[PDB]
Amino acid sequence: KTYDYLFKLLLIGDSAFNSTFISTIGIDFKIRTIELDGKRIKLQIWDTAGQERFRTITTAYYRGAMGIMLVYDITNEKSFDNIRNWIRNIEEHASADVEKMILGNKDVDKRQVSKERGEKLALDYGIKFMETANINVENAFFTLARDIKAKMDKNWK
């Protein structure tokens, strides 16, 4: 094997190069590699950020997901309430064993969603919250991956 762990991750919530062909088909998922404590971590990531669903969400949507990253734009009130809707839907259709994390995101705007509001949301649902400074979305994935790694290690022995 060429890695130590494989984590399946879901990236959810609203908020430059160009390949037209690729724009037309769309991306299914990406595979990325990171290192955590000298172990090699393979991430398989489905990202439906900036994507409104038309299709009704089922258990099949969240089956196998090991971690879910929930993103909203701190400048956008709709995008924050959108994460509250998602958290609701996850608690119903996704395994109660899935790791979850909320991300308050966003260069170039007035802050519309306060940090306290974001912190209070995480508290009400018992999951972690980051506002992405030198600290961004990559750091968030490292943290989510860290959390899945720790849980996973105990289970094995």
């Binding site: 060429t2 190069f17 690729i22 088909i25 991306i27 299914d28 998922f29 590699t33």
Partner: protein, 107 residues
């Protein structure tokens, strides 16, 4: 050709996105292949290419993107900048993923 393919037929060099340098494959992870495959152009139609790296499991890729299915094909693109197709996979063959050498760089 040169210091590109080992005696065992493996890639001596890392495989990178030409446009952004994202690392697609580590050295020694793929086999050289001359199978003829059609890859749509990375712009605007495409090329019949016959030099590829053959990779036997999607999780061997260091960083790569997969398109949604086009019939039973999934195209490979750069994970970071999404430029592609840089490669090709037929879902009926679970253990065969091809990165075209013309569509990538080597370091």
């Amino acid at each position: 050709q040169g210091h590109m393919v080992s005696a065992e037929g493996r890639n001596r060099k890392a495989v990178l996105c030409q446009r952004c340098g994202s690392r697609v494959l580590q050295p020694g992870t793929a086999l050289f292949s001359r199978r003829q495959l059609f890859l749509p152009s990375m712009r605007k139609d495409g090329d019949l290419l016959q030099e590829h790296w053959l990779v036997e499991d999607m999780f061997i890729f260091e960083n790569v993107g997969f398109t949604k299915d086009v019939g039973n094909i999934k195209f490979l693109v750069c994970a970071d900048c999404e430029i592609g197709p840089i490669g090709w996979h037929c879902l009926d063959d679970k253990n065969s993923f091809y990165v075209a050498l013309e569509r990538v760089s080597h370091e």
